[PDB]
Design a protein around this nucleic acid. Structure first.
Ligand SMILES: CN(C)c1cc(CNCC(C)(C)C)c(O)c2c1C[C@H]1C[C@H]3[C@H](N(C)C)C(=O)C(C(N)=O)=C(O)[C@@]3(O)C(=O)C1=C2O
Ligand SMILES: CN[C@@H]1[C@H](O)[C@H](NC)[C@H]2O[C@@]3(O)C(=O)C[C@@H](C)O[C@H]3O[C@@H]2[C@H]1O
Ligand SMILES: [K+]
Ligand SMILES: [K+]
Ligand SMILES: [K+]
Ligand SMILES: [K+]
Ligand SMILES: [K+]
Ligand SMILES: [K+]
Ligand SMILES: [K+]
Ligand SMILES: [K+]
Ligand SMILES: [K+]
Ligand SMILES: [K+]
Ligand SMILES: [K+]
Ligand SMILES: [K+]
Ligand SMILES: [K+]
Ligand SMILES: [K+]
Ligand SMILES: [Mg+2]
Ligand SMILES: [Mg+2]
Ligand SMILES: [Mg+2]
Ligand SMILES: [Mg+2]
Ligand SMILES: [Mg+2]
Ligand SMILES: [Mg+2]
Ligand SMILES: [Mg+2]
Ligand SMILES: [Mg+2]
Ligand SMILES: [Mg+2]
Ligand SMILES: [Mg+2]
Ligand SMILES: [Mg+2]
Ligand SMILES: [Mg+2]
Ligand SMILES: [Mg+2]
Ligand SMILES: [Mg+2]
Ligand SMILES: [Mg+2]
Ligand SMILES: [Mg+2]
Ligand SMILES: [Mg+2]
Ligand SMILES: [Mg+2]
Ligand SMILES: [Mg+2]
Ligand SMILES: [Mg+2]
Ligand SMILES: [Mg+2]
Ligand SMILES: [Mg+2]
Ligand SMILES: [Mg+2]
Ligand SMILES: [Mg+2]
Ligand SMILES: [Mg+2]
Ligand SMILES: [Mg+2]
Lengths: 206, 36, 101, 113, 84, 125, 83, 100
RNA sequence: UGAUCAUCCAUUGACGGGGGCCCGCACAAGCGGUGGAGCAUGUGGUUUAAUUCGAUGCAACGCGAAGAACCUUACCUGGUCUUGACAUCCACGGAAGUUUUCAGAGAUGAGAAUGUGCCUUCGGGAACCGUGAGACAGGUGCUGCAUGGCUGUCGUCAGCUCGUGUUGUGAAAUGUUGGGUUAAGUCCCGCAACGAGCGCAACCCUUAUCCUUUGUUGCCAGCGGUCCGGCCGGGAACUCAAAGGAGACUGCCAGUGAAAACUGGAGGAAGGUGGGGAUGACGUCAAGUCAUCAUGGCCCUUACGACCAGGGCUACACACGUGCUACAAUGGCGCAUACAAAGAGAAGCGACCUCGCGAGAGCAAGCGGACCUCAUAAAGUGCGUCGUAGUCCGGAUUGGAGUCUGCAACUCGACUCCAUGAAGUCGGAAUCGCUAGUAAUCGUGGAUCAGAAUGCCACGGUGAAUACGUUCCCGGGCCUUGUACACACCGCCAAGGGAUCA
């Protein structure tokens, strides 16, 4: 049957929020919609730059966007050229002053979003799905995940009948609330249609 | 040689490869077992 | 499955009786009806209100063998059921008349 | 008593007994009684003959009985002659005030044909 | 019903239509979609062709009609019985 | 000297101040019989002092907030027993044997999605 | 009187921000009357989780808005109204 | 929702803001106790001749992401579906699964 | 072969009416309902110009819709537009925009004034408009049986598997079975298995007790007054608020047991999972959703796209589902008078006061709230009245007269006033919910929302009855056996109406 979102259920238990501002009802919806337009802009611009997470704070008349990226050199650029010109667009979008900070994902093979994006990248190059899945699981366990599960669903290998296929290695205890389960998804847009990727990475209990 | 076990609601398709004699849900694992 | 004293007389049997008579949680409404009925009963009989109530139960109490908790439970349920059917004007008097009979 | 062609019940309170007149509900009743100056809860039997004449007086201020029935009948008859939507609902014997007819509407329609 | 404070609603386009009909003394049917417009006294004697959703239904205005809406005289749904 | 106890029952909370005397009962600046109408309430408030045989030896100023008549009477009783245990701790065992020292923890179970109430399901056909 | 109202969606965050204003006011010689935990608003929301039908399938969410007052006789996402 | 329907909502918001004060003025005459019947009559006939879409009640709250006109929630500005997706991704501050 | 060897007038499953052992408000025991009535609401059908589309046994039918008068709106009728309502790109025109005029249902068209700013290499503009261009936009069109995502369902049931080893020619088997035990593949013991993964449990939220900290907007025990109101000076006790701790472990005791556990006892606010919630294994039904969104393919492109007004989604011989209100006296009515919790609020909640019979209106404080407002809890209790009547029960329906929201309540709102006073007198076969602060009943609040709940989501008050038991019905678990089933009994022979022997 259907399952609770692993990130959602653990918010405030072991997982932090990605938006951390305060607002009253009058400012709340506008802040969500500006946050949406910020995250949308950056996800597009930094499609090649290995973006895992976009954390948004809003201090006193400001937006602070922290971009968690495995390739900070690509995001930052030369003399912080690229940081500064993202920062203008974010400040335009949010309609307030903006700092962009660039945080580094040191182990991208342990980042659920980066792993999911890698698989969907490979699926769109017409890499065989089983190979892409196996490589993800092996990489994460090599780099010291206590477990990983990868699910791929859709018209796998352009088959007529859609299928779900998954591999797991190690522990992925989804009912354990204190389990540090990084969970994220991605979509591969193929010639045959959408294939969904789901990745769960377990990094010990807290 | 693909073989099958029936279960409630379907069938589990498995593979066997006469190289020894192994058995696995994937083909390459069956070879590794059979070679071992 | 597969695996409190009434505050006027100290008889839990009457506390049960209030509960059987009670409808919709209205326990104070039930209590008044029963006490009114017991004093009425006593005036047209001449005992302490439990003795007449207990003699009234003895005639109803059914004897597969009924065990004595279900026995008094059935009696009281049948009394209340019998009382509610009648064409006396209030439930207090319906109950008093049914208990008398 | 007899007030406006209706034999008003003698063993009822004046407030209640007066509602037996068509065109007189509970509030017009209490209005009549407090104007004529009889208590609501006094029985119609107990009133002296002069007091009934005062009750008969206060009801003549209102439209009642066959005056009202003509008045009601004329209102409904105007609608049908007018041939407005309300009049068509009167004509067909359906709900007049926008109610559901897919189900229910049995007060107006009668029992199921 | 509309509050007495606010008075009676008619559409301005219709109020002008009806005035022009009186001034000129024309009896050619006045075509309107304003079902929600109240019938005023100066309507009397005009035929007002009221839209019912597909057709303009003529309403020769009478004195009994005044105070009612125009759309009261243009039924929208067609029903001629079931099993018939 | 006053010996205090809090009492609680459903959504009710009761502040009870016992001290020696002839046996007045104030509940929110009203007598017992003005405050509580029902005789089930009034027994329940005297149950503890009836038990310990100190009906006419102890005055009682009570405040009570929240809940209803039986809840508040139950809150009051809890507080009187809690006040008595502060006065004399020989009375604990006997008051516990009367079942008074227990905070009746039974509360209104919440309404739930798909059910009309806490447990009442909608009708099936 | 300097009267400090703090709101936050997180209670660890509000107690820290409180502790900054409070201890800082204590350092100077302003008479801090103690920090007062006011009632947390638990705002609640119930949504259908299916895109279509399945009316009994729902999620229930809550935002807890924590509230602190401190009288005198910061982290982004802590609210501050000093009157 | 279709692109046209989202664009209808934009147009209605803009006209509501354009005529807000002009609508408020004309309505205030119609509500007023102490006024002429001629000015009131005029004021009734002016309020109708404005764009219908300048009335605020012609606006439907839509999901800001999708345009869905059902299941809207005011605090988030989103439908039930996009609220849920954002909630579970940790994108709505303070919002967590509730139990009590 | 699954695999293996005009009009009203041999293996694995599955299955058995084969066997054994179990569980769940499944039955039983109860309590209250549904089915009858009126009405609300959804659906079918029928009707219609249209009655938009979707959901269809359990698991569709107060379901998507947390709110269809216009809008929403997808539908119909009619009026309209064609690079376009919504984007980018290019040429050319041009500041944006502020008023009003006429025609038109409006869309829109034709005007006529007014403003002609501001960035600024005085070099330009880029802001936002218009005309033209064709690359394209657009589609709630089709396929949920091409898909992702999300969801229902078995069911919070105790299952489902793998590695390595061992056994079998092999499909496979073992572990996972067995003896107990448990809410539980829970735990223990035995055991060719040894371990592990996903489920169970725990970690999470809330509720029941205490403690520390803190003390306003909350609080009032002791003081000092009092306009007798925590109203004021005060107090920090107490209620409470909400941070941080403590607490429950079968830990203790006794008995039973071959150990796990079970049964009772102490203490304790709480006792065996304390109560409630969140949490939904591998899979099952080509289950639901291309109309939230996304998306392969197909299809439409002066139309299947787009704009407008009016109509429809509210139709009514009828059938079905879910509700509300009743049929009274355990009650109705009148008067007086107690005790809640939880929540919402800025184009918002709106007091006091004045006016209105009332819905409401006027005036106008306060409150982005422990302060102000919504905002009298109701059932209760007391006293009075009605006296078993189709009633002083019921409140349907209809007439007249209003109020309010809204450009607008004709189709088609809610509410009030006066009048009216229908069916209904406890509901056939059949059928539903519930095991305790539950059911039942009583109010209260909230989301959607201009307005529009009898629905939904939450909150307290009062507050039961009954459970001997598992034979039977329904769903499910484990083991074993028969099988001509594998689309898997909705099958194509089970005890087939050889099994069965516990
Ligand atoms: C003609 N057939 C075989 C068929 C064919 C297709 C493919 N083409 C369909 C279409 C293009 C709409 C003509 C289909 O897509 C489908 C079905 C069967 C239905 C049956 C339906 C049924 N009723 C609702 C009617 C039911 O209760 C059950 C059930 N399992 O209980 C179902 O499976 C269904 O819901 C269903 O989903 C179907 C199909 O998809
Ligand atoms: C009552 N719940 C059942 C039960 O747990 C079944 N196992 C005995 C279980 O079996 C499965 O796991 C299966 O193996 C087969 C599938 C159709 O159902 C799955 O879900 C089945 C569950 O739905
Ligand atoms: K719509
Ligand atoms: K799907
Ligand atoms: K063999
Ligand atoms: K094995
Ligand atoms: K379905
Ligand atoms: K498609
Ligand atoms: K309409
Ligand atoms: K209708
Ligand atoms: K209903
Ligand atoms: K019904
Ligand atoms: K009557
Ligand atoms: K209407
Ligand atoms: K069997
Ligand atoms: K045979
Ligand atoms: Mg009458
Ligand atoms: Mg309740
Ligand atoms: Mg429902
Ligand atoms: Mg779209
Ligand atoms: Mg609206
Ligand atoms: Mg039964
Ligand atoms: Mg019925
Ligand atoms: Mg089906
Ligand atoms: Mg419409
Ligand atoms: Mg499907
Ligand atoms: Mg098994
Ligand atoms: Mg286990
Ligand atoms: Mg074993
Ligand atoms: Mg669990
Ligand atoms: Mg014990
Ligand atoms: Mg299908
Ligand atoms: Mg379908
Ligand atoms: Mg569709
Ligand atoms: Mg329209
Ligand atoms: Mg409808
Ligand atoms: Mg009545
Ligand atoms: Mg509200
Ligand atoms: Mg609040
Ligand atoms: Mg009759
Ligand atoms: Mg149970
Ligand atoms: Mg078992």
């Amino acid at each position: 049957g259907q399952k609770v979102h692993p990130n959602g259920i653990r918010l405030g238990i072991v997982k932090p929020w990605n938006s951390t501002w305060f607002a009253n009802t009058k400012e709340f919806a506008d802040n969500l919609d500006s946050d949406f337009k910020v995250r949308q802009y950056l996800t597009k611009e930094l499609a090649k730059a290995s973006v895992s997470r976009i954390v948004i704070e809003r201090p006193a008349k400001s937006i602070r966007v922290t971009i968690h990226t495995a390739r900070p050199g690509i995001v930052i650029g030369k003399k912080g050229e690229d940081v500064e010109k993202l920062r203008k667009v974010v400040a335009d979008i949010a309609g307030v002053p903006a700092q962009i900070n660039i945080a580094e994902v040191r182990k991208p093979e342990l980042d659920a979003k980066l792993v999911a994006d890698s698989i969907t990248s490979q699926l769109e190059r017409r890499v065989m799905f089983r190979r892409a899945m196996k490589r993800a699981v092996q990489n994460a366990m090599r780099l010291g995940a206590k477990g990983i599960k990868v699910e791929v669903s859709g018209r796998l290998g352009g088959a007529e009948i859609a299928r779900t296929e998954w591999y797991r290695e190690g522990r992925v205890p989804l009912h354990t609330l204190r389990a540090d389960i990084d969970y994220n998804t991605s979509e591969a847009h193929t010639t045959y249609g959408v294939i969904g990727v789901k990745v769960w990475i377990f990094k010990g209990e807290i | 040689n693909r073989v099958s076990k029936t279960v409630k609601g379907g069938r589990i398709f498995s593979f066997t490869a006469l190289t020894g004699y192994g058995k696995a849900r994937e083909v390459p694992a069956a070879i590794q077992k059979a070679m071992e | 499955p597969r695996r409190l004293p009434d505050p006027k007389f100290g008889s839990e049997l009457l506390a049960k009786f209030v509960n059987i008579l009670m409808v919709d949680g209205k326990k104070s409404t039930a209590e008044s009806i029963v006490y009114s009925a017991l004093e009425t009963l006593a005036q047209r009989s001449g005992k302490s209100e439990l003795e007449a109530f207990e003699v009234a139960l003895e005639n109803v109490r059914p004897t597969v063998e009924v065990r004595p908790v279900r026995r008094n439970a059935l009696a009281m349920r049948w009394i209340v059921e019998a009382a509610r059917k009648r064409g006396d004007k209030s439930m207090a008097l319906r109950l008093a008349n049914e208990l008398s009979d | 008593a007899r007030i406006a062609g209706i034999n008003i019940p003698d063993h009822k309170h004046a407030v209640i007994a007066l509602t037996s007149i068509y065109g007189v509900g509970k509030t017009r009743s209490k209005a009549i009684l407090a104007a004529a100056g009889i208590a609501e809860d006094v029985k119609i039997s107990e009133l002296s003959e002069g007091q009934i004449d005062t009750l008969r007086d206060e009801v003549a201020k209102f439209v009642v009985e066959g005056d009202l029935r003509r008045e009601i009948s004329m209102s409904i008859k105007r609608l049908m002659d007018l041939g407005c939507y309300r009049g068509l609902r009167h004509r067909r014997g359906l709900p007049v005030r926008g109610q559901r007819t897919k189900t229910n509407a049995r007060t107006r329609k009668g029992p199921r044909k | 019903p509309r509050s007495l404070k606010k008075g009676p609603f008619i559409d301005l386009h219709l109020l002008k239509k009806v005035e022009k009909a009186v001034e000129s003394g024309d009896k050619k049917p006045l075509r309107t979609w304003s079902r929600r417009s109240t019938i005023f006294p100066n309507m009397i004697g005009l035929t007002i062709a009221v839209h019912n959703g597909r057709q303009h239904v003529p309403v020769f205005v009478t004195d009994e009609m005044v105070g009612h809406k125009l759309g009261e005289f243009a039924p929208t749904r067609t029903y001629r019985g079931h099993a018939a | 000297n006053q010996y205090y106890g809090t009492g609680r029952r459903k959504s009710s909370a009761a502040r009870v101040f016992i001290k020696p005397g002839n046996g007045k009962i104030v509940i929110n600046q009203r007598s017992l019989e003005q405050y509580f109408g029902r005789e089930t309430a009034r027994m329940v408030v005297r149950q503890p002092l009836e038990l310990v045989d100190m009906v006419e030896k102890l005055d009682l100023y009570i405040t009570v907030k929240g809940g209803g008549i039986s809840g508040q009477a139950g809150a009051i009783r809890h507080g009187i027993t809690r006040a008595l245990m502060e006065y004399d701790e020989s009375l604990r065992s006997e008051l516990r044997k009367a079942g008074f020292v227990t905070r009746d923890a039974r509360q209104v179970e919440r309404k739930k999605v798909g059910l009309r109430k806490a447990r009442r399901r909608p009708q099936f056909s | 009187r300097i009267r400090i109202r703090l709101k936050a969606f997180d209670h660890r965050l509000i107690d820290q921000a409180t502790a900054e204003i409070v201890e800082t006011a204590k350092r100077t010689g302003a008479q801090v009357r103690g920090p007062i935990p006011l009632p947390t608003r638990k705002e609640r929301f119930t949504v259908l989780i299916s895109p279509h039908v399945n009316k009994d399938a729902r999620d229930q969410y809550e935002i807890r808005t924590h509230l602190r007052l401190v009288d005198i006789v910061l982290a982004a996402g802590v609210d501050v109204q000093i009157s | 929702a279709k692109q046209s329907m989202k664009a209808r909502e934009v147009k209605r918001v803009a006209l509501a803001d354009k005529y807000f004060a002009k609508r408020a003025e004309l309505k205030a005459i119609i509500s007023d106790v102490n006024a002429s019947d001629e000015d009131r009559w005029n004021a009734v006939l002016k309020l109708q001749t404005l764009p219908r879409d300048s009335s605020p009640s012609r606006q439907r709250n839509r999901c800001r992401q999708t345009g869905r006109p059902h299941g809207f929630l005011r605090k988030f500005g989103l439908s039930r579906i996009k609220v849920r997706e954002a909630a579970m991704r940790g994108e709505i501050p303070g919002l967590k699964k509730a139990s009590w």
